[PDB]
Each structure stands twice: as C-alpha cells, then as structure tokens.
Design a protein around this nucleic acid. Structure first.
Lengths: 703, 254
RNA sequence: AAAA
RNA sequence: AAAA
C-alpha cells in the first residue's frame, strides 16, 4: 500500500456496506455492515489490507486506537496518513453526491426503474420499466459473487473497478424514489475526488471552499476529415480504431503523470474525455507539457487534419454540487475555454507560421515504449503491441477489448478495459466484407446502405446533471447503448422490445452490415441498403426503450452505387442528418425526395409518421423478400403513375390538377383521392406528398 | 472605410470561389502577358506599399456578403431550446450581408442569411475497373456571382487591377462599384483575405495549400501578413500573396 | 458535426 | 438541403 493507493481504494470501498445491509447479512446499517463484510473478508483469504480498508465504511479517539491496533507500519503508512485518508474519503463521499427494496431509477426517465441485473452486453437490453421491489435474495446472490471476486482481485483500483462495475451498475446508490445515480458511479467519483484532494496537499472546511480541483476536458476536432477523407471499408475501421487508441494514450498519460486512477476518468466517449484532478502547480505544468507534446505529434503525423483541444478549470468542492447548479455552470466555463482553444488550433506549435500496418486494425493492445519489437501502431506518448489469444501481453498498462475480466495477464500490468462496437459481416474468405460484397447482398437494386445517427440535444440532457456521479451515470449509460448493444441489435436481438419495423426481408442470421463507428451518442454503419433501412428503425426503437421514451435520435440514410467514394457518401448522409435535425429532431431522412420550396414541406419524416405510412401502404403493394403482391405484377405501372402525380403536386401544391388524376385511376390508395382540408387549414402537406417515402423503397426492393 | 468592389458577372459555372492568393496569382499572371515582368514588380511594390485585395465573396443583386468574423463565435452567449439551435446556425454561417457584418464587428445582435446565392455541385462521371469521380462547379442563382475589394491608390487600380481583370474575363464580365464598410477603431482586425501571418493570431481557422494560411474571418492584432517570392524552376520568380485586408473588430474579453 |  |  501507500496513502495514494489507500485513499483511492477507500473512496471505492466506502459504500460497499450498501449492498450488504440490503442483502440482510449483519442486522446493522450500511456503515457497520460494510466494516463487518471487509473484516470478515480480510480474515478469510488472509489479506490484512481489507481490515485497513474496512475502516472507511464506519471525536476520533476510538478510531485513533482502532488505527493503532492495525499497526500502520505493516503497510508502510503513518497513523496520521490513515486519519487523512478517512477524513478525505468522508468529504469526497459528500461532494460526489428511504426503504431498501428500491431499484435504480433511470437517469433518462426518473419515473421508471431498472430490474436488477449485472452489466452483460451478451444478455438482455436494459429497459426502464414499472417500479418493482428488488428481493433481498437478488442482493444476497450479488454480495456472494461480490465476495468471491474480491477474494481473488489483486487489490489495486484497476482490478477492483471492474468487479464493482459487473455487479453494482444496476444498484441504486441511495434507496430514495426518483434516484438516478448508479452505486458503481457514486463509488468511482468518491475515489476520484478523494485521490485529487490527497494530491492537492489538503488534510485535516478547507478543500471544500477553495479551488483545489481541476476539471480537465479533451475534445478532438477534425475527426470526420481524419476518418472519412482518404487516398476502402477496412481503412475506415482502422482509422476509427486508431483515433480511440490515440485518445486512450493521452488519457492514461495524464492519469500516469498526475498520479491518478482510471476512476478519475468521468468519461471517454465520442472523442471527448473529462478527468477530475488536483489543482497544484506540478499538475498544470505536467498538463501543459502533455498538451504541447500531443499537439506537436498530431501536427507531424496528420498535418492540420486532427487537432486535440485540452483545457482545465480551477474548481472548488462547492461547485461539485447545487446551492439553489454550480457543477453545470463550471462545465459551461470549461466548454467556453474549449471553443476558444478550437479557434486557436495548433497554437501550441510556435513553428506553425514560418499506414502499412494501420489497415490490419486479438484480445487488446499493450501500451509500451514507442521503441519496442512488435509495436503495430504508435500514439503521441506510447507504442501499442497487439495482444493475441495464443501470446503474452507487453507493457505497463494493457487495453482489453469487450470484457471486465483481467484474464491471464501479469499482476503488475494495469487492467484497462475498453468497449468498442466492431460488428462486421464475415465473407467466404473470413475477412471483413467490402462495399461491393455488401451492395451485392441487397434485395432488388444493388446499392450500399449508409446511415449516420445522433442523439438529439445531448448537451441539454448532460447540463441538467447536478453532480459528478450523476454525469458519470448519464455519460456511461449513453455510451454503453452505442458501444455495448448496437452489435446485439444488428444480430436480431430484443425482437419483443423492437416489434414490427419497416422491413423488406426476413432478418438474416449473419447480416450484411459493417460498423465504422458506434460510441458516445452517434453511429456510422454501412451494409446492404434494405438491411441498413430496417436497422435505422430497429436502433431507433431499441434506443426509445433504452431511454424512457424521453430521448430521441435523428438519422440520415443514403443508398449509393458501391463505387461512390467514402467522402461523398459521408457528406450526403451528414447533410441528411443535419436536415433531419433542422426540421425538428426525432426525424429520419429515409430517401432522396423532391418538394415544393414553399417553406411548408419537410424532406425528413418524424419516425412514428414514417412507421404509420409503412404499416398503412406497404402490405397492400409488397409481399416481402423482393416481391410485389400478385395484384400488382401486371400493374407495377400504378406505382410509377402515383410518383408522376406527386411530381405535379411538387410543381405547384396549389394547382388542383393532381386531385383530378388521383380520382380517375384509383381502391388501393383511398386516402390520396380526396383533397384533405384538415391538412390545408393546419398549413401542412397533402398526403400524396408523403407517399414517395414508401413507394420509392418498395420499387428499389422489387427491381 | 470605402473600397472598389470588382463584380465578376459569371457567363456560366465557376470551379471555385477564388480567395486572395489565387486572385493575386491570376492578376500577376495577366499583367505578365500584357506589360511584362517590369509591371509585375510594380504591382508587388504597390501591395507591399499598402495596397490590398480581399478574397472573392458572393453577391446577390444589390446584396454584398462578407465573411463572418470568428470574433462572434466565443461571444454567441450575449430561451434554452432557442440558444443552442440558433447558436449552431451562427457557428455554421460562412457569410453575413454588409449591414449584419457591420453589427457583428461591434458585437451587437445581427441575423444570418437564409439563402446563399450559389450552390456547390459535385457532378459525377464513371472512369473507364470502373470508379466514380466528382468535379465541383459553383452554379450561381440569377443576377448573382462573386466580387472582391481593392484598397489603395486609384492609379494602381486603373494601371494594373482593371486591365488584369478584363484580360481574365476573356468566364465572366467585370464592373466596378464603390463600397463603404463601417468598422470600429480597434487594436484588433478581421482579414477579408487569406493571409500568411507574421505573428500568432488571436482567433483563426487554418487553410492548407505546401503553404499554411489563416482563413477569411480570422482575427489578428497588427498583422499586415506577407508575400513570398520563390523559385520553382519555371522561368519567372513566382510571388505568393498573403497580406491581410484588415477591418477593425470589437472582441469580448476571454 | 449534438460527446464522431 | 443543386444527392433538389
């Protein structure tokens, strides 16, 4: 041990009492029951540190003697060091911030609650639902697996964070109604604020009213240019993978040089990271060096393409909480410094005004020295050595893909679990499928499907967060939808949650789908055009259930000649995402369309509106699996005529010719024959305007 | 101050909205073809001596557009669901009309154009394996096109800029107009031209061409920019224009 | 390009 | 929303 490791582990384990009082193991309240659990655990196995760490869950005279009985010297600590750790973690617990059957209520919708489950991406989709009691038999099963895992874990924050994450993400931190904070998140932010207070040199209300903390934020800018402008799909995934490693290399560099723990990472999603740190002179000097060195490396490696904007703000304990929302106000002053810094891009290089192994982008990567045999790619501070199943890992830190389990890695190696959505269609060769092979798998027209998606007003959602631990639950839960569950949605899971969606075919066992990126609040996914079309609706439905029906996505879809260069496809779907946003959010740009430019005609559809149109029109004309209804085999012409009629409505929505034509050649589309006054008075389009969204899709499927 | 606006009236699609470095390039070239290098040397002297041209900007009828100064981006906090939404359209806008440009300079409220009088158009063609390539063309709306500003002696304009521009039209026609831009007195300026800076700027966007320019709308403090003579083995010395076209600009304290 |  |  040392005071650092102690204050961090104590921050983490301060509240381990909560699950043991709710498992009914030791009669008393969470404080004493937590002490008893770790003391019981220390005497089992025989690890004395758990009895030292047991002190945290509990005018000091009694405690002074309990601390002496433990003999601090045995662990290389003073009696005085332990008193600080305990007072620090006690303050850290307040700043991070009634029955016992109460579940975690959803941060997306506080009126709905999570069933008890452990974080498992392979199992069922977390859906906020009706408020149920959690039995003290679910908590008892938890506390046993929690005791089994802690018996084996090396007792460093990196081996403890994961087991606390497996088992306590879906546990309420405090069993009050409308409570939104995950216990795991409360625990990691208490450890975060604790280690920072220690590092800020404060001891024995000083650090609370003083600016002893830094909020550090890093935002990458030019990500689109870095990723989508090249000269193949393989390359695109490789650049995407590369950006995530560059970002980790900078995050772990800051944690390493400031003497901090992965618990100090509030979030690392979508090219944004936030870290809580000590406001010391040593720390600001150490950040400026890292900022300067990371920018110089980006400039040399990719020219002006990929910038990293790093800023920090001095902050007090006050500002981690409410007083009438100081935390959001602090985060706003930080954002503003980041916007200024993004308008001074590469200003940290005074010199300014005078790929062979990439594509290949195993269980993770070793973060080693730049100069090391086997280094496949390099970041600004470190080399990355691929960690393969049949091989041994290399480096101080090990990045491990899509598990919270350390595995057969050395005990000196820092465990850094990272989640990535990397689903791809496997080809006969076994390689990741090409634009061409995906396009070829399409129903009817051979086109590549491309979709870009975005949560609406994420910034707004995050700024109604009062506390670090709230924001930590918000960012993690948001990130895990995209990193954790989009793979499962692609595989065809959650059929009962998703329901009937616009579809042109039976969902394949192995979909013609490759993810480029899914993380933070966004996705870029390509595949067979008909499978991409359906996937937009599956993802929107999964996301609606995942939130409380309180958060919305907008999506841009496009259907392209497989020979269209990436940069065009990305610009067109980017334009259509932007269009869906500007027309009101919670919209999908389904297909390219013509319209009157009278300021009344939206190009995108409201999700529910398109889904009702599909329900209404598709079954009357489309059999499924590339097949028109029997009625329409010899009358496929009716469908083109409706589109020709719709063009004369687009020419002039006011000229009433289109209505004469609709009556004459139509009982297959009755709701298009009469003029709808209801729409006219409401200043909205005629039904005919909307129908192309369904007909164009059917006609693509049936060619 | 007051300036000469050079209106390029387009007789078909353009390939690019030209910025100051390529306008100077073309003008310098034309003058070489008409009066020889003697005259190129004098044009350079006039510019080093205080003369300036802006980059080309859209006009529509009697409406002149100017680059949105980067000064207003950090200031945009001057509803809850209206701030974020408008704020993302202010950040996306490349151009303001003359009147709204003059308001932005003094950090007063201003409105964005709703239409831009041109359209970038990626025209596709199959390249016989087959691939698809795009050529971008700027199609202008009706009575619309592109203009740039000249600041300096009338004799440099009459003797070099005017004759250069007619030769260059040979595709466009050219007409000249007086333009007044009200700008506040200030330690700080916006450039209406892309520029090779001599100091580190206040606010900027980079522009890679290999040369590193700051973009039209960037903010400088007493940066006149600079020209580069350089040798590419191609007979004549080539001059690269990166002088600033400064208008005074009020900043927020940040 | 709403944290890609 | 010059991939109207």
């Amino acid at each position: 041990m040392e005071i650092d490791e102690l204050t961090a582990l104590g921050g983490l384990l301060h509240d381990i009492g909560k699950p043991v009082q709710r498992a009914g193991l030791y009669s008393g309240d969470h404080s004493t029951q937590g002490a008893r659990f770790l003391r019981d655990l220390a005497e089992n196995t025989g690890r004395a540190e758990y009895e030292l760490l047991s002190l945290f869950s509990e005018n000091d005279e009694l405690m002074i003697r309990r601390i002496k009985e433990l003999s601090p010297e045995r662990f290389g600590l003073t009696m005085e060091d332990v008193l600080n750790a305990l007072w620090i973690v006690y303050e850290a617990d307040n700043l991070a911030s009634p029955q016992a059957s109460r579940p975690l209520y959803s941060v997306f919708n506080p009126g709905k609650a999570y069933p008890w489950a452990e974080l498992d991406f392979e199992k069922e989709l977390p859906v906020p639902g009706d408020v149920f009691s959690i039995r003290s038999q679910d908590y008892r099963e938890l506390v046993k697996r929690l005791w089994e895992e802690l018996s084996k874990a090396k007792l460093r924050s990196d081996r403890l964070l994961p087991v606390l994450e497996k088992y306590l993400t879906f546990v309420s931190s405090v069993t009050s109604e409308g409570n939104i904070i995950s216990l795991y998140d409360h625990m990691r932010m208490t450890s975060a604020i604790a280690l920072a207070m220690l590092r800020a040199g404060c001891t024995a209300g000083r650090c609370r009213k003083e600016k002893r903390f830094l909020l550090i934020e890093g935002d990458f800018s030019g990500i689109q240019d870095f990723i989508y402008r090249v000269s193949t799909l393989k390359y695109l995934r490789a650049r995407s993978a590369y950006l995530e490693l560059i970002g980790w290399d900078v995050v772990l560099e800051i944690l390493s040089r400031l003497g901090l723990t992965r618990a100090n990472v509030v979030f690392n999603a979508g090219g944004h990271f936030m870290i809580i740190a000590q406001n010391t002179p040593d720390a600001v000097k150490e950040l400026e060096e890292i900022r300067a060195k990371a920018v110089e490396w980006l400039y040399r490696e990719f020219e002006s393409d990929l910038y990293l904007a790093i800023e920090w703000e001095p902050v007090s304990g006050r500002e981690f909480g409410r007083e009438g929302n100081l935390f959001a106000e602090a985060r706003k002053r930080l954002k503003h410094k980041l916007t200024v810094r993004k308008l001074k891009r590469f200003g940290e290089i005074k010199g300014l005004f005078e790929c062979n192994r990439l594509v290949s982008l195993l269980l993770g990567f070793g973060r080693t020295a730049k100069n090391d045999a086997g280094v496949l790619v390099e970041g600004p501070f470190s080399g990355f050595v691929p960690y393969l199943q049949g091989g041994r890992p290399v480096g101080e830190q090990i990045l491990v893909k899509n598990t919270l389990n350390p595995g057969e890695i050395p005990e000196s190696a820092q465990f850094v679990p990272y989640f990535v959505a990397d689903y791809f269609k496997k080809d006969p060769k076994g390689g990741v499928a090409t634009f061409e092979e995906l396009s070829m798998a399409s129903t009817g027209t051979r086109r590549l499907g491309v979709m870009k998606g975005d949560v609406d007003r994420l910034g707004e959602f995050f700024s109604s967060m009062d506390s670090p631990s709230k924001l930590a639950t918000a960012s993690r839960f948001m990130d895990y939808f995209f990193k954790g569950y989009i793979g499962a949605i692609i595989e065809g899971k959650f059929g009962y949650i998703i329901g009937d969606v616009p579809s042109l075919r039976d969902w394949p066992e192995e979909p013609d789908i490759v993810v480029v990126y899914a993380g933070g609040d966004a996705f870029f996914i390509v595949g067979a055009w008909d499978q991409i079309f359906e996937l937009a609706f599956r993802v929107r439905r999964a996301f609606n259930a995942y939130t409380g029906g309180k958060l919305t996505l907008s999506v841009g879809l496009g259907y392209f000649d497989e020979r269209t260069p990436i940069y065009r496809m990305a610009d067109v779907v980017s334009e259509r995402l932007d269009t869906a946003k500007d027309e009101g959010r919670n919209r999908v740009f389904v297909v390219g369309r013509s319209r009157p430019l009278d300021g009344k005609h939206k190009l995108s559809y409201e999700w529910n509106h398109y889904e009702e149109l599909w329900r209404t029109y598709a079954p009357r004309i489309y059999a499924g699996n590339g097949r028109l209804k029997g009625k329409l085999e010899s009358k496929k012409g009716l469908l083109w005529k409706l589109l020709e009629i719709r063009e004369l409505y687009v020419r002039d929505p006011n000229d009433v010719r289109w209505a004469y034509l609709t009556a004459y050649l139509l009982d297959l589309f009755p709701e298009l024959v009469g003029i709808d006054t209801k729409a006219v008075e409401r200043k909205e389009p005629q039904p005919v305007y909307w129908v192309d969204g369904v007909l164009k899709i059917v006609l693509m499927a049936v060619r | 101050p007051k300036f000469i606006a050079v209106k390029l009236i387009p007789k078909g699609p353009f390939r690019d909205i030209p910025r100051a470095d390529t306008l100077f390039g073309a003008i310098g070239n034309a003058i070489s073809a008409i009066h020889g290098q003697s005259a190129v040397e004098e044009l350079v002297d006039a510019f080093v001596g205080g003369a300036r041209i802006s980059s080309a900007f859209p006009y529509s009828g009697d409406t002149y557009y100017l680059p949105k100064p980067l000064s207003v981006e950090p200031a945009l906090e001057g509803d809850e669901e209206e701030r974020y939404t408008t704020a993302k359209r202010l950040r996306k806008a490349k151009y303001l009309d003359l009147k709204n440009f003059e308001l932005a300079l003094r950090l007063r409220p201003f409105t964005i154009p709703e239409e831009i009088p041109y359209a970038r158009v990626d025209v596709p063609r199959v390249v016989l394996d087959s691939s698809i390539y795009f050529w971008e063309e700027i199609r202008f709306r009706e009575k619309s096109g592109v203009y740039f500003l000249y600041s300096g002696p009338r004799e440099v304009f009459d003797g070099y800029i005017a004759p250069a521009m007619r030769f260059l039209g040979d595709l466009f026609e050219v007409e000249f107009h007086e333009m007044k831009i009200d700008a506040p007195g200030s330690e700080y300026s916006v450039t209406l031209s892309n520029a090779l800076p001599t100091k580190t700027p206040v606010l900027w966007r980079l522009l890679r061409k290999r040369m590193t320019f700051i973009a039209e709308g960037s903010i400088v403090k007493n940066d006149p920019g600079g020209m580069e003579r350089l040798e590419l083995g191609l007979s004549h010395e080539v001059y690269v224009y990166g002088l600033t076209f400064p208008l005074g600009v009020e900043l927020p304290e940040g």
